[model samples]
Structure formats: C-alpha cells, structure tokens
Target: TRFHSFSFYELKNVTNNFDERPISVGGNKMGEGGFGVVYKGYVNNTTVAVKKLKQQFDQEIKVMAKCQHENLVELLGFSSDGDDLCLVYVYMPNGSLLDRLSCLDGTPPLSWHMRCKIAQGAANGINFLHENHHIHRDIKSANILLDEAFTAKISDFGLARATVMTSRIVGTTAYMAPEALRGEITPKSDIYSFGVVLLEIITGLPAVDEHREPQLLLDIKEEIEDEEKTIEDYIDKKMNDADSTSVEAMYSVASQCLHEKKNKRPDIKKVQQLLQEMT
Candidate 1:
C-alpha cells in the first residue's frame, strides 16, 4: 500500500510494448529468468527496468516495498497486468555482480579494491535485511545487482515472509547453505550465499561445474579448505593487485560464513564488521 501501482498500459508504453525481439532487431528486452522477462524502459528520459513476473507477487511486493535502503533495489512501482504482473525499478546499467566478476562483454576485471568494496556493500545490504526481520530466501551474486557506479543492491526478492512457500527450494543449489538446501531459510542462509559471492569475486569461478555457465550464474563457495592451498593459490587470475593479506582476511570470513552448521556462521552484521576489518 505504500508503493504506487502503475497501470499495465503505462508500463507497455514505456517499454515499447515490452518487445523481446533482439536489440539488433529493435527489441527492448533487457533480461529474463524464473521470475520473467525484463525490458529496459525510459520514463521522463530516465531509465528504468520493467520486470514482468510470470505471475501475491502483489502482497509480497508490498512487503518488500515497505523497506528501503541504498543497498536495496529501488522499487519504483508495479503493474497488475493479467497473466504476468510487472515490477518497475531504477535501471541498473552495470547489471549483476556476476557479470562484472566474469568480465562479461569485454568489461574490465573488477579491480581488487572495488571487489572488496562491493563485498562490503553487499554485506551492508544483507545486514539491513536481517535487521528488518525478513528472510530473503534468495541471495546469489546474480540477485546482487549493480548501478552504473557499481554500487551493490540486493534484488529479486524471494521473500520468505511474503512468498507462498510451495515447498520448492528457495534459491539456487550452488549458493545454498547445507540447511538451506534442505528447505530451511534463515538470515544465515543469505550469509551463506554472500559468502559464495565473496568466493566468486576472489576466484573468478562459479560455485561448481567449472567454467562456462555465465548465461545463468546460479552459483560459489566450498573452497580453500585445504591446509596446503593458501588463498593465493585460489586468488582470481583474472584480477590483478589483490593484496594477499586482504584476500586472506576475506577468505577467513567467507569460510566462517560457509560453515556447514548455520549456528556457526557469523550473523550478517558480524560479517559486515569483519569486512570492515579488511585493510
């Protein structure tokens, strides 16, 4: 009730009817997935992302919209288009952190310092969610989007409080905590996913299957446990200038976050404090 309700017709007008033909063929489709297809739109000459959910996407949308933070995706509004509702958002030109980590489309590798900064931002965002008393059932690098400035923002909520919970797995298996994989979701679950994300940025590898899954990242974690293999052994070759001390520090935090026992993992706030310890 706190957010505006946009008309379906208004959404269609902004996205050229949400055309999905290839951009080369003049379509506006920006992205798509289990939620639905997204199109880039311009309203008042400002860019926006229009997510047409396959469709309470309505009631949950309200729950999510109630909370706001710089690290949380700005939910501009939504549309009640039948068969497929729409959610509007401020455009994230840089797209998902997963893309930046992989250097997708020839984009430069994320600098080591920026990688650290990005992790901190994501931690802050996740911490905010934990403080708000809602469990984000989904937390993957793909769900952590980036603005043009590369500021991290949590997106695509599979909010546990608002979702119907049809007994389906809440998020991708690769980024899941041991408990999360067994149909459990707590703030700790998000921490596990964040740890996986931290691992990905450092190693430039997916959680599993090794190489070539960028079309849908859905994956990172469960690494660097060997006593013989140091953090340098697994540091991303794609990334230059990763100070060993800083990298090692992060690995410890990530390890704690990925612990098999949920009770053992640091709370999101504690995780952020540790991230701030990086120098």
Candidate 2:
C-alpha cells in the first residue's frame, strides 16, 4: 500500500468539504456488489470513482489493507467524516461485463486477443492475493475492472478474507462451487468462480440467470467440454470469426478449473502461467 498521511484540512480542501457545487458531481450508480453502490466520479481535472463503504466494505478494508499489487486496483486513499466512509480509486473508461453483454446498442464484442489478455491479467491479480494467503471469495466478470488500456484489475474485494478468517462461506451463488454453495468458503472456491468468469468471457454470456430456468451456467460448461462442440459454436458468434486456437485454449482452461474435486483446481498462479504460455 502507498502509505501516506493526509491532514484533515488537505482532504477537506481537495474535496471541497461539504460544498455541493464542484465536489458534488452527479454520478450514476454503476453496480451494487459486496460493497455498496459503486459510483463513477470526476475530481476537477481527473476522473475518479467511489465505493461508498457498507458493512461489507468495512470488513474488506481490513482484509485488503495488506494487499498492494499492480494488477489489483490501488487504494488511492480513504475518506472518513463521522459515518461517511468512501474509498477513492482510479476509474476505468470501459464499463463492466453486464453492460457489454446485455446492452445491444454499440456493444463492442471483445476480440479473442482481448479476452485472453483479460483472463491473464485477472489471474495475475488473483494469484497475488492467494500468495499472500488471502482468498478472493468472489471472482466474477463484474468484479474484474479494465483500464483504458484494457488491462484487467481485480476489484470488489469485499467478500475476500485471509485464510485464517474462517467464519462462513462467501461468494456469488451463480459462480461458486458446490462446497461454497453449501456455505463452505475455501481458496479453491475462488478457482471455481474464476473458471465461470473465463467461460463467460469467451462465450460472451452471463454467469447465470433465473429467467433462463433450468438452463444454467453448467450447460455452457458442458458445451465447452464436449468433443463435438467447436470453438466457433460456443464462442460469441458476433465476433468476426475469432481464431479457433484462442477459443480452444479458453475451453481447455475453463474445463480444467471446473474439475469437481477441489484438489484438482489449479491455483491462480498456475492458471496464469498456463494462459500466458498459450497467449
């Protein structure tokens, strides 16, 4: 972490304190995750974003305080005035997975190369946390943010906890493992969720949806595994013919990560190592 002390007066002047004119820029609520609403903001000359800390943020703040990695979103600073605790972070121009997958108008399909880069970057970020003996309890496309360069940075560490903080299971239901679904939180749980994101990225599909009825994410996984199914069949057909090799590599990795036995799940570092070689 970039350690620095900020005087109360400095923060007040920078943010314009309680002034509504410049400091209070209107920002649409981007998404609601473990943290409260994430709002994109502008700070005078530069663009910024805010994660208004809820109960989850409080816990995450404690856990992420130890993490400092390039692939992880840097915690620029934190602001607190009584109960108002807002975390400031660098803003990414591109929106999230939900926006790209669902919004029909001008929804640019991510190229195969871009998808591979995202997967590699995400794996690096997750590997860092796991190396530090921390677990990213939630690993999903929505939680992975992309910079202007399209480099992936893992965000929303709200569900994360150190290996020692074994209280209860944590993660999104749609992407979580059966063990996690049974309320058993473990480092391998993250591997399962990461695989779901990989599949979502390659297929240009959502992680899960109740409206889909019995048709679930598992169906997509099965399709990727089947020998009869080709990369072109499972991938986003909208892409201008993504190279077959890239799509095949994605399928292989996703299938490996989804192995039913927890011990078989590749560590994030190993996943990145293999994907980097493929790229």
Candidate 3:
C-alpha cells in the first residue's frame, strides 16, 4: 500500500490479475513498441499507468524513484509478476504534448500562452533532473505528458542515467544532439533535445518532415537567419493570433540550447531562467 513498495501478487491483484479488462485498450494508450507496453490500470481505485517491461529495468526504476516533481511524472511503485516486471505511475489524463500537437481529430491548437506555460513547466522538470545529477537521455514531445489542466510533466526514464556515460546512441533520432549521436552523453544533451521540443511547441511540426527532406533544426536555422523571414514565418500558423513577443522570446531560448556544440548549449537551469522571464 505504500508508495515505494509493492509485492508481485499485490500488483497482479491490483491490475485485475493482469487481465486486459482493466487496461485502457485503445486510443488512450500510453506508449507502444519499446522495451514494454503501457496500460492504463488502477490501484486502490487510483488510476495509474502500468508499464510491463520485457526485462527488469532496474536502473530506470531506481532513477524514477528518486525523481519527484510537479513537472515530472510521479512513480508510484513496481512489481514483478512471473516473467514480467511492471512499474506503476500517475496516469496523465490528457496524453502527451505530441498527441496534442498532432491533433488529427480536429482538436484545436493550444494557445501561445499555454504553449509558453507548458514549455516552462517542462523546462522546470528537466531542470530538477539535471540539478539532481540525473540525465534523461530521451527528451521529446511524446515523453512530455499533460494533465487535465494542460500542465506538462516529463515522463519515460528508460534511458536516464545518474552520471554522464558514453553509451550507444539511443533516443528519437530527430531530437538527438550531435554529441549524443556520436555516443557521447552529457546533461547538456538533454537540453539540446529540449530545444527541439520547444521548436515542436512553437512550430506544431514533428521533429522531422514527412519526407524527411528538411530536419526541423536546419529548417529553423534557415528561417531564423533569413532576414526576410521572421519568427511568425516558421511558427505554427494555427496560432495566427499569438503574441509575437512571446514567440520571439521562446525562439531565442531554443536557439541557445540548439547550438551545435554541447558546451555551447545552456543547461536546463539557464533555460528555466530564460523561460521564467518570458512568463
């Protein structure tokens, strides 16, 4: 019953014997095609996202245990039932920032003000992690979940590390910094990814185009450097009536984080400060 501990049988019973009935089977699915599957389940009548990992993710579980913030998804507990290891978390009702941005069902775009709020919230979460000495190797819109009120929370610690480790390049390709792609990882790499998420927030575009013809960062650079083009020219047109000043401010912050050199990129704390000023 405690937040930090759970037995195998306890979670199995809580999840309705691992039956499909308790899972939110369709469109509201949390994550698909990774090292596991995520199901919307319940424990003590409290809604939670239950992730069944293919293997025991000891590092991820340990990392999640230490991370708790308003802008970070809370890890409730975990369990091992038979061959499957499951982790429980606070369910994000509104899905992810990616879902909201790619609203194919005609959901209206988020207001520019709301985008700023979300960006700041997400930045604060990453700031907390970096300050605590944890590196979230994967930072992208899909991993940024939203609550009913549109508050953004960082999620998915599958690739998180307690120290900077040079490992195999992992994560969504479009969001990976050059250093990360070269099998080098530092806290600043996460900041670089955050910059891409910021771009997604501002432009309402995927990290890459459908044809993959022009990467978002390259396209952004081109747009920003072109004297004839302004921030409005690249931002999401759905937000046609947004405040230009707010848009410009975010662009400035993202530009700094997206610098080609890792050392040149600002840390999450710096990004947080800039975002706070914008708010």
Candidate 4:
C-alpha cells in the first residue's frame, strides 16, 4: 500500500520518460512544494495531477487510500522508481477553488449561493477527515481543488496524518494554528487552518499580507475580529456590491474556528452544520 508501486516501464511510457515537454495537460505547472514537482498531465485521455514525492513519507499513501470522497480529490494510483516516488490523482479542470473563490482576478466576487455551497462542501470534507481520526494538517484555498462542475475537492495530503499520536507539526506557516507554530499539532490545528481558508473564501484577501493595513498575521486576525471591518471592507474590492448575509455567516463561523484556545474552536462537523443551515 505504501508507494502504490508502479512499474517504471509503464510510468515511462505514460509520462514519455518524464518529458517536461507537455508535462501537464493544463499547459503549465500547477504548483510545487517540498515534495517533488506536481504537473497537470493526461492519462487515459483524462486529465490528472502527477506529483513526485521528495522523501518517503507514508502519510501520502495512507491519506489517499483512506480518504475517498467526492469532495476530496481521488488518488488513482502511485509510482516509485527506486527511491523516487510519484502519485497520480484525478485532475481538477476548473482549477483551484482558491483561485476562483478567492477572486484571483482582482474582482472579489462570488455569489451568495456559490459561497454557501463552497463553504458547505469544504466543511463536509474536513468533517469527514476528522470523523476518520485524520488531521488535514494543511487546509487552505490552494489545497481546495474543483472539478469541471466546480465542486470543491480537498487536495494535498503529503502532510496529513490519520492518527494524532505524534506531537510533530505538519503544515504551512501562513495557515498554521498558533499551537502548531509552537510545535503542537492536533485536530484543532486543522480547525485553525480551516478558519483561515474560510476567511479567505468570505473575504478576498490573503490571510497574511505585508502590504495590507496591519500586514502581519496577528494584525490580520485583529482586523477580522474588529467590528468595524465590515463584510465589504474585509472582502476583495471586486465584490463591492455582493450579498453580505453569506459573508457574515461564514465570517462568524471562521471566527469560532480561529478561536485562540484550541478547545474553544468548533469541530469541522459543527462548522459544516452551521453552513448547511444558512445555505
């Protein structure tokens, strides 16, 4: 189960000996990380994301095999060439929900209905992970993939873990829980990341921006907490006249998730339930 143990010959044929030319079906590299490069490629006439692992972390294999849902990207299979490792997963044609929902175009505009749907779907995925006793570890817009229909599918499991037995930290700096920054990782750590991602969904701004007013991470938190930071003020300017109900509802839920105390934070299920009621 560990590597998915793909044949080098088959992999070479499928990837044309790992040709950088047309490496991705989407026409460009999607993203990169500490793990090996990830390219958008085509397999069996369908698009997919091919990731090369940097090191042998069993988490990737475990998370992919155990976590399978419509809202979570499917792990078709994996490959390993000696110490080298590769993973093939279903491709998200609509690109990232982060790009669309986050308003990458400078116009922070997502309909109230769309925002509610995204929040509900994303929450459901995280809830599912927790129910399975897994910690997403890294939850963010960039990790939320979208199918052609735009359904949000949680992505990137290299850092995810099925058991919370370990005290080691696993996640990105910007979205990490306060406790995680200090070296403790728990389900609550995921809630914190979820909060930051949810905040990004409702508002059209990065969680940590040095250029913005109060550019530090703490400043961003204070601003979101402040009553004066209206839904309009926090959101990307592109969504100038969008509905505020969904925005407020999501913001409130995010506030609970971002609670300073780990115990004070609501679980993914509660967050999903809140969004469901509103939607």
Global Cα RMSD, each model: 3.5, 4.0, 2.9, 3.3
Which residue segments of model 3 deviate by more than 4 Å?
Answer: 1-29, 54-56, 163-167
Between candidates 2 and 4, the one scoring higher on lDDT is 4
* Cα-based lDDT for every prediction: 0.78, 0.70, 0.80, 0.72
What ranges in model 2 sit over 4 Å off? Answer: 1-26, 54-59, 103-105, 163-167, 211-214, 223-231
Better of 3 and 4 by TM-score: 3
C-alpha-based local distance difference test score of model 2: 0.70
Task: Please give, for residues 175-228, the per-residue lDDT of candidate 1 as tens digits.
Answer: 877777777757778888887788888887766664553322232232234344
RMSD of 4: 3.3
The residue-by-residue lDDT of candidate 3 on 1-279, one tens digit each, is 345666767766655655654224533245663877777666776888877774336776667767889999988887755667878888888888998988745677888888989999999898899889888889999999999899999988887777245657787888988888888878888988998988888888898886654655536666667665766777888775678887888899988988988888887878988998987
Give the C-alpha miss distance for residue 196 in model 2, angstroms: 0.7
lDDT of 4 by residue, 56-140 (tens): 4556666677788878988877776675677888888767766786555463466656766777888888888888988778888
Using lDDT, give the best candidate's number.
3
Model 3 vs truth, CA RMSD: 2.9
Clashes of each: 0, 0, 0, 1
Pairs that collide in candidate 1 are none
Q: Model 2 over residues 92-148: C-alpha lDDT tens digits?
A: 767665455554348677777777888888888888998998878878888787788
lDDT of 2 at 137: 80
